[PDB]
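Note to self: the last two entries modelled the partners one at a time, which told us nothing about the interface. This time every component goes in together.
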Amino acid sequence: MLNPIVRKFQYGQHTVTLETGMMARQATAAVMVSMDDTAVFVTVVGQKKAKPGQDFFPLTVNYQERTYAAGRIPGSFFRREGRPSEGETLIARLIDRPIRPLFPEGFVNEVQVIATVVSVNPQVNPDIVAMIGASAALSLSGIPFNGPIGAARVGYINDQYVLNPTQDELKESKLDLVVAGTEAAVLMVESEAQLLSEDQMLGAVVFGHEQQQVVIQNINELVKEAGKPRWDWQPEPVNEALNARVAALAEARLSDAYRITDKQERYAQVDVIKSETIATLLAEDETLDENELGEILHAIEKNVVRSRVLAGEPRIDGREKDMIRGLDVRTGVLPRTHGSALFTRGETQALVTATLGTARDAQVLDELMGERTDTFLFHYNFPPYSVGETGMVGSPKRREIGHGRLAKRGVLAVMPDMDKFPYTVRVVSEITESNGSSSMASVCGASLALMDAGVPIKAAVAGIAMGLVKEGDNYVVLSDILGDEDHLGDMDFKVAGSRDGISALQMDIKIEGITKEIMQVALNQAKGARLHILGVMEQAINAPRGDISEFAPRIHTIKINPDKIKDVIGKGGSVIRALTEETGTTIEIEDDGTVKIAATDGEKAKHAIRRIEEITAEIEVGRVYTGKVTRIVDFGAFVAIGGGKEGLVHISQIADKRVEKVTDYLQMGQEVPVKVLEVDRQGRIRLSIKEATEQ
Amino acid sequence: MLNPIVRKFQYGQHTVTLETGMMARQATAAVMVSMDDTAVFVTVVGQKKAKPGQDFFPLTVNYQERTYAAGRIPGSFFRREGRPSEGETLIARLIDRPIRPLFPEGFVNEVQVIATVVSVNPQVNPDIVAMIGASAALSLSGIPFNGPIGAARVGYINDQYVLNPTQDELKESKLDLVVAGTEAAVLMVESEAQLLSEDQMLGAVVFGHEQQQVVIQNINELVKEAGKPRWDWQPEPVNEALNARVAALAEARLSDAYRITDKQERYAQVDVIKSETIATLLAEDETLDENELGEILHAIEKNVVRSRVLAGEPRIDGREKDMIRGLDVRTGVLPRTHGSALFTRGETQALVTATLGTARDAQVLDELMGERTDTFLFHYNFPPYSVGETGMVGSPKRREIGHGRLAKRGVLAVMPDMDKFPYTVRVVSEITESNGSSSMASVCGASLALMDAGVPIKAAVAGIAMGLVKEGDNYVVLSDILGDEDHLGDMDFKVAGSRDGISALQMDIKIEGITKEIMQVALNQAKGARLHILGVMEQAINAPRGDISEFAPRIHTIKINPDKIKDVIGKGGSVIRALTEETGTTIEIEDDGTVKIAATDGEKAKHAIRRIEEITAEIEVGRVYTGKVTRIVDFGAFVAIGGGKEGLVHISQIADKRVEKVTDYLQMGQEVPVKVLEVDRQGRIRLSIKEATEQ
Amino acid sequence: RIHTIKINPDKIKDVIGKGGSVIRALTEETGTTIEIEDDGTVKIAATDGEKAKHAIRRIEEITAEIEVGRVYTGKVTRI
RNA sequence: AAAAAAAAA
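The predicted structure of the combined assembly is written out below.
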């Protein structure tokens, strides 16, 4: 017999129902969390024996949208769900980022969270349910986990926040925000606004968290009811003796080594002190593990840099907290792309290039909720020759498919509606040099490129990453944090919007609790920095160009009869294939008879128009048709005319005189007007050269 | 001028042509076997030096169907043969399963059998030829190998077995089983039958074996002719000292531990026993191999459990050999899937979900034999958390692609014929905890889910996995064998049929010398256990639900006049495309008048059928024909009523005198009755107002 | 391969049928694609020589111009 | 012989 421990509550309008104990009894824990007929079956399995000699914590969070949820057989040719799509990868990252800061420091047991989506309802998005499920499953398992973590989505409708808006409500809403936080404080935010002021976004975050408190309480109750006993796990007791021994020698020398302004001399000096210290550490005692010493060194570096930045001393870069790294924007770097730009800030650099296309190229996304065509593709490539180290290129890693979406959220607030711009922009942005905040450089460069290729966007957008270092009650906010600063910093929060309003937020706090006022101060400082960046960006190019680049495919529209569209299709499309191959353009066919002529140069466009027009032109009374007989035989020569309908001039219809041979009657290259009297349906159109040859 | 060695023999109606020595000389041994113009080129490469510290036999059997065999350029966009399809993986497992228990124990040199298909007569299926080829190759190579193995594919027609039928016959046979065994015993059997009684199945097995004795004899002849000298490979002699100091010190204690009925106490006891034995033996000598120590320990405990079950003592579970594990059955566990079930037996369970789709989703796979459309998809998912360990979710491994086909072979016997039920059932079963006999749990859950979603299958169907332990003349046969028992047990059955007859008989014996009487007894016990499981299943769901779920797309078929399809539809598909884009349903037509209406809503299907009846409106006596005339011209009154139905209203039928303005006597938009006088060949339709106003 | 035969242009309508029932029935029977032009030139495209022979024979039975000395199978259906 | 335009581219 099976004993399903169910526990259901009320969240917003729907009724979440946690249900554990019935399935996957062999995994460490598994709950089937269902909200309003949308069910996600999260399961955790974490090994007990720590891998001998591990350095980084290997938590992986697969997320699978099984397409038998909506009730459809998949569309792929193998007719089976395969490699995870971009949406599923993004939602896996969204599940991953809240929990990882919660696993206690020094934990290195493999842990895997495989949250599938068994059944979906088009009104309720699954991802929020999957997040609740991952939190509940982890809390049940007894793996060392600091807290249950609620998840909420907030929408802005008619100036009142709504919790967990349904998709139909979401279309109306200005802001779509996901706030996931523990009982103590916000843990992550991943938003996409529509140029709201910073106060509205902060209100949204605080509202979402204050509300999801309920999910937290109820998951806690479930854990108390039907959970497993907590693991007996203790962190590695800190070897105070070795740490203090290494510190007594390294503290002052490394403090002064980091005090000096020049970066690379400090690099060399700290590396040589590192080699000296590790050589002594080995020579005095071989048994001491190298990774322990490396952890010690990381601790010393983090401690000294944090102590410095807290006191107000200049950062490792040499800038003040407010100062942004110097920028240099360039446009038209690439010769033949529809529009390109190169946004170099400090060391982070991005070569963004925007290319227009016609409606045939818009991505057609088949996801669980419903079918959807996307007409703004943003791709973000992070090649390994950026950081400075070799590495195999390949399919885009998870972080690239996350930052693509982030930059796309950043830019989507300002793109023009399709009726005003009948194109499908695709923006790529390779990162040639990365030193921190690559995605926001990509947002800036995308604004630049779009402004250059001629898209009539509303106003330039710009993104500036930020940081936070807080100890006790002493806190100081940072701007344009380098990567080295980010590792030491306690929070990284990325705001990207126009001067008027915020287009995209993506906080990721990691330590203790951040009071609302702290977030407010950080957001305001970010507004200032972003205004400065936008000024500099405006210095280069301030208004989008007059028209698209000459290479860009212009749009020409012709009207033809509804039967004519089938005529131009032909067998499987042979006529349109031949037309595109002979003309070199791109033709779109609609059932109402509209024709879309898309070609770069106007000459190819008019070429296509004429070539199609001859076949579209119906043979008209009085107007003679241009026909060339392709084959002549002794018993008659038929003048092939085209259009699927050929009129044959039988040997008995030419003249009453005995036609002896067509060669002396019709010669090779005899282009003569033919008098057509009518258009018949019997398949035997009457042609007559006799009346045209009389004069 | 190298010379091949050719030996050809009769094998049923087909003739087989073994041939070696001409190609692939540098491979260890290669044999091109051709049967009746189907040729499969099998080659085997065997390394000579065992990899150091190798523990498991790394034999890997590949199999590639080169689509230039049938004489066709590949379909795929790259015009090149892609990764192995599901069929090729299936036949790879087919070739693999018989020849793995045949290599001697302790052989660990890598071996690879690559079987290519170079020319395929669309009648003779290749798999049998490839199996004969792999047997001939291995037995030719001189890699240590017990015996050449023959393959047959017995069919069942007119209650008479037939050897190795062709596709044309196979469309009429009830049972197709690939009994491939050496001369001594039937090594492997894989079956698919339409509810044949067990006795017929076992008769087919024994007949196939008696027949393929021929291939055995002649492969032996060819090996004696043109073989290679056998490798000099000797098994590692067992170390009597280690065996004695483990046995005489611990084996009695392990026997007493396995006497304990409880699982967990016994676990703890065997743990402390093995730890104590290891500790004392290393205290005696440290250089003693811990790996070999544990290996001998595992051998000891295997011997203990085998002796226990042989004596007739209760098994590790505590069940008697006959009784099945516990059961629990739930149906409709997911909210929005078309049908679902959760078949949980003992500690092996499966979440099956059947999802109906319209006829456009049927997987169309291109095989060498000929393009075949598949309208029943079974998919088997074995995620890692099921067995309790973390792993790498990804593309389905080989064992899944095998068990999916097994379960589909088990269910296909009972699914309805396409005329009675026109859909595209796709069944997905995800194992959530597996401890032996997972695939048969999947078959049970699939029968349940199908019965839930509302398909009218002919009868419920269930599966049980038998196990056999045999020593000398003493043999005991188990039921619902656990995962742990299976390795220790010798042979494995998987019977899966309705109460009336068997449907799948996959079996995989290892020991040599099982009389057919033993298999008869085993199948009898399996019939008993399967009747029991079906009795339990009968409680939850009795008969298939009358109506499919409201979420299901509903397909409605109407018959129409096949001649009138050209009159109402017309050329070019204009009106059909218009109707499919206005109603959003899919419409097709047959030469007889068969037309299917498929739409995810009932009311939409009603709208579509209304439109079809309006366009296909006959001439109903007494029904009012409404025409809306908005403008009048001198030639007539143009009225748009669809279907090209337009008649020219003559001026002489309006009034006797010349009408100066038509609107004085005929009103605009006024309903005029129109009775058809006759339907001419040229589509001439005339309207009659005068005779229709009064009648 | 592509098989080309020249048939009298006027007799195509005897065998084409109303709405093309005969031609499509024959193609689905022989598994090939037949092509006919207003000049009566019959184009048989096939994926095999054997299907080519099958289709071409079936064309000879009906589609071929009426030949003297060709026997016609006449069966009464009702007395 | 009824019909835009390719994971198986």
